[PDB]
Motif scaffolding. Sequence first.
Motif, PDB file in Angstrom:
ATOM      1  N   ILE A 117      52.817  60.567  43.223  1.00 28.08           N
ATOM      2  CA  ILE A 117      53.099  59.912  44.493  1.00 28.08           C
ATOM      3  C   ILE A 117      53.867  58.620  44.254  1.00 28.08           C
ATOM      4  N   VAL A 118      54.803  58.350  45.156  1.00 33.79           N
ATOM      5  CA  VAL A 118      55.520  57.087  45.245  1.00 33.79           C
ATOM      6  C   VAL A 118      55.269  56.541  46.638  1.00 33.79           C
ATOM      7  N   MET A 119      54.820  55.291  46.725  1.00 32.49           N
ATOM      8  CA  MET A 119      54.643  54.622  48.011  1.00 32.49           C
ATOM      9  C   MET A 119      55.453  53.338  48.002  1.00 32.49           C
ATOM     10  N   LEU A 120      56.448  53.249  48.884  1.00 25.97           N
ATOM     11  CA  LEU A 120      57.306  52.073  48.992  1.00 25.97           C
ATOM     12  C   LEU A 120      57.119  51.438  50.361  1.00 25.97           C
ATOM     13  N   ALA A 121      56.978  50.113  50.385  1.00 21.70           N
ATOM     14  CA  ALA A 121      56.811  49.364  51.626  1.00 21.70           C
ATOM     15  C   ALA A 121      57.648  48.097  51.579  1.00 21.70           C
ATOM     16  N   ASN A 122      58.172  47.697  52.740  1.00 24.98           N
ATOM     17  CA  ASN A 122      58.872  46.419  52.859  1.00 24.98           C
ATOM     18  C   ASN A 122      57.966  45.302  53.347  1.00 24.98           C
ATOM     19  N   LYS A 123      56.737  45.299  52.837  1.00 21.17           N
ATOM     20  CA  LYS A 123      55.841  44.158  52.899  1.00 21.17           C
ATOM     21  C   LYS A 123      54.899  44.265  51.710  1.00 21.17           C
ATOM     22  N   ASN A 124      54.573  43.124  51.110  1.00 19.03           N
ATOM     23  CA  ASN A 124      53.681  43.060  49.955  1.00 19.03           C
ATOM     24  C   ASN A 124      52.248  43.062  50.474  1.00 19.03           C
ATOM     25  N   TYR A 125      51.588  44.214  50.410  1.00 22.51           N
ATOM     26  CA  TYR A 125      50.202  44.345  50.837  1.00 22.51           C
ATOM     27  C   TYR A 125      49.317  44.650  49.636  1.00 22.51           C
ATOM     28  N   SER A 126      48.010  44.474  49.825  1.00 25.30           N
ATOM     29  CA  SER A 126      47.127  44.346  48.677  1.00 25.30           C
ATOM     30  C   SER A 126      47.039  45.628  47.851  1.00 25.30           C
ATOM     31  N   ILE A 127      46.936  45.443  46.535  1.00 30.16           N
ATOM     32  CA  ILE A 127      46.955  46.558  45.594  1.00 30.16           C
ATOM     33  C   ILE A 127      45.780  47.501  45.814  1.00 30.16           C
ATOM     34  N   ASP A 128      44.610  46.968  46.204  1.00 28.36           N
ATOM     35  CA  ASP A 128      43.457  47.832  46.451  1.00 28.36           C
ATOM     36  C   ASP A 128      43.780  48.888  47.497  1.00 28.36           C
ATOM     37  N   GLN A 129      44.579  48.532  48.497  1.00 29.21           N
ATOM     38  CA  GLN A 129      44.933  49.503  49.525  1.00 29.21           C
ATOM     39  C   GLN A 129      45.932  50.526  48.999  1.00 29.21           C
ATOM     40  N   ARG A 130      46.896  50.090  48.179  1.00 24.05           N
ATOM     41  CA  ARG A 130      47.852  51.026  47.589  1.00 24.05           C
ATOM     42  C   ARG A 130      47.124  52.095  46.792  1.00 24.05           C
ATOM     43  N   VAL A 131      46.213  51.674  45.918  1.00 24.28           N
ATOM     44  CA  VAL A 131      45.536  52.617  45.038  1.00 24.28           C
ATOM     45  C   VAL A 131      44.599  53.521  45.835  1.00 24.28           C
ATOM     46  N   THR A 132      43.916  52.970  46.842  1.00 22.96           N
ATOM     47  CA  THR A 132      42.984  53.774  47.635  1.00 22.96           C
ATOM     48  C   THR A 132      43.724  54.874  48.383  1.00 22.96           C
ATOM     49  N   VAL A 133      44.831  54.526  49.041  1.00 21.62           N
ATOM     50  CA  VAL A 133      45.598  55.524  49.782  1.00 21.62           C
ATOM     51  C   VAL A 133      46.167  56.581  48.841  1.00 21.62           C
ATOM     52  N   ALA A 134      46.727  56.159  47.703  1.00 23.32           N
ATOM     53  CA  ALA A 134      47.259  57.122  46.744  1.00 23.32           C
ATOM     54  C   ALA A 134      46.169  58.057  46.247  1.00 23.32           C
ATOM     55  N   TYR A 135      44.999  57.503  45.926  1.00 20.93           N
ATOM     56  CA  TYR A 135      43.876  58.322  45.484  1.00 20.93           C
ATOM     57  C   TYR A 135      43.505  59.354  46.538  1.00 20.93           C
ATOM     58  N   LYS A 136      43.421  58.932  47.800  1.00 26.92           N
ATOM     59  CA  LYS A 136      43.050  59.864  48.862  1.00 26.92           C
ATOM     60  C   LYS A 136      44.107  60.950  49.049  1.00 26.92           C
ATOM     61  N   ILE A 137      45.388  60.595  48.938  1.00 27.92           N
ATOM     62  CA  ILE A 137      46.439  61.599  49.101  1.00 27.92           C
ATOM     63  C   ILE A 137      46.424  62.599  47.944  1.00 27.92           C
ATOM     64  N   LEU A 138      46.416  62.108  46.706  1.00 26.29           N
ATOM     65  CA  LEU A 138      46.453  63.023  45.571  1.00 26.29           C
ATOM     66  C   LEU A 138      45.197  63.885  45.510  1.00 26.29           C
ATOM     67  N   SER A 139      44.044  63.316  45.876  1.00 31.62           N
ATOM     68  CA  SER A 139      42.806  64.094  45.875  1.00 31.62           C
ATOM     69  C   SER A 139      42.884  65.238  46.865  1.00 31.62           C
ATOM     70  N   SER A 140      43.676  65.063  47.915  1.00 29.51           N
ATOM     71  CA  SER A 140      43.794  66.045  48.973  1.00 29.51           C
ATOM     72  C   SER A 140      44.577  67.277  48.545  1.00 29.51           C
ATOM     73  N   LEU A 141      45.310  67.209  47.437  1.00 28.42           N
ATOM     74  CA  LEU A 141      46.294  68.237  47.116  1.00 28.42           C
ATOM     75  C   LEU A 141      45.719  69.458  46.411  1.00 28.42           C
ATOM     76  N   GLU A 142      44.410  69.518  46.177  1.00 27.30           N
ATOM     77  CA  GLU A 142      43.800  70.727  45.643  1.00 27.30           C
ATOM     78  C   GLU A 142      42.318  70.710  45.976  1.00 27.30           C
ATOM     79  N   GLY A 143      41.713  71.896  45.957  1.00 26.88           N
ATOM     80  CA  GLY A 143      40.300  71.998  46.249  1.00 26.88           C
ATOM     81  C   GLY A 143      39.445  71.325  45.194  1.00 26.88           C
ATOM     82  N   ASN A 144      38.198  71.050  45.562  1.00 34.28           N
ATOM     83  CA  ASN A 144      37.244  70.506  44.608  1.00 34.28           C
ATOM     84  C   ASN A 144      36.688  71.628  43.745  1.00 34.28           C
ATOM     85  N   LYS A 145      36.506  71.338  42.462  1.00 31.15           N
ATOM     86  CA  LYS A 145      35.925  72.303  41.541  1.00 31.15           C
ATOM     87  C   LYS A 145      35.255  71.586  40.377  1.00 31.15           C
TER      88      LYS A 145
END
Length: 359
Positions: free
Chosen positions: A331-359
């Motif tokens: 994943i690549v997330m680009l924004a034209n405002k500097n927002y907190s890193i905790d939010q970047r990582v949390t959103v990326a984690y939620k998106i990538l986790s979504s891309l396959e079933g749990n096993k």
Amino acid sequence: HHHANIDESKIKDTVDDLIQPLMQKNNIPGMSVAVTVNGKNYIYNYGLAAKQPQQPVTENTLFEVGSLSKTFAATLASYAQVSGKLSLDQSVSHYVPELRGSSFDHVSVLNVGTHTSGLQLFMPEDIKNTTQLMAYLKAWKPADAAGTHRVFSNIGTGLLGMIAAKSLGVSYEDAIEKTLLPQLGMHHSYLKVPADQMENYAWGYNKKDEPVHVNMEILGNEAYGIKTTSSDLLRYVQANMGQLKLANAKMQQALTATHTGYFKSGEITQDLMWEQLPYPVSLPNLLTGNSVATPIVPPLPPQENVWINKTGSTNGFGAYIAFVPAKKMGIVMLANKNYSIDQRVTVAYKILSSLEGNK
Ligand SMILES: C[C@@H](O)[C@@H](C=O)[C@@H]1NC(C(=O)O)=C(S[C@@H]2CN[C@H](C(=O)N(C)C)C2)[C@@H]1C
């Protein structure tokens, strides 16, 4: 149009559900999010590259990526290394003769490539030219020996890129814009945005919501110079996972070798500019990862079962890349405002986790 059971719609629903609240809560004018999985690529654009006159984010919008730029300096150093022009274990003063007899007799190229030289984060503001820079470096001493601590450094990354480029016989700007980015197929990636692309260069918005672009100062190209599209960065992610024909055989080896693990700090493994954690990652250690440096010797070879990532920011922009080679997803997330890193990582984690079933 939305289509049930179609890849791009299923991914868009997940991304929309996280990115739209993220942009509202942080007052982020515009974002682009690019996702790769199963060899297929998905680009989602949101909001505005500029407010007045209004311009939307499009597939061509360029964002500043800040310290993501450091991974390009690392890739260049790795390319020089695999090409036989550079040894990471050699001293900085070996390659920069004006620094011979200084502290840089005891700093390796690897140290500046891993944030372990001890050089401070920011270049002093009064250093304007190479003569002043060399006088500064010749007179510099860290409080602790090189190789003992991790300190993120724009100066160190500057030296890494300068040494790599010189070992290839060129300036850093030439090495990046004429060799590295073209070999990677990243045709909409720049250290200096050309006139035909200025209409696509998003404005950044600072903490006061003022429109800003980064000011390039000495050795700034290495540490924060890249402006690029989410599509080009997704190609870079795919190349880092060996998915593209590409460049060179040497270029693929260079990209992969930047994932070598050289130091441990807390739970984080420091690669060549990239940082990684064992995968699966739990969100707490991701957040905990954002110091004493312990060498990994022999270095940890590039791995599949890891979360590899890098954040980058400027005064007006906030960027993030994460990828998991074992899952061929990123994943690549680009924004034209500097927002907190905790939010970047949390959103990326939620998106990538979504891309396959749990096993
Ligand atoms: C343009 C630069 O001045 C800044 C970054 O964008 C600074 N440089 C670094 C850096 O990444 O080296 C971070 S520190 C941050 C510490 N860990 C991050 C990281 O890579 N993560 C969180 C994955 C990076 C400054 C703001």
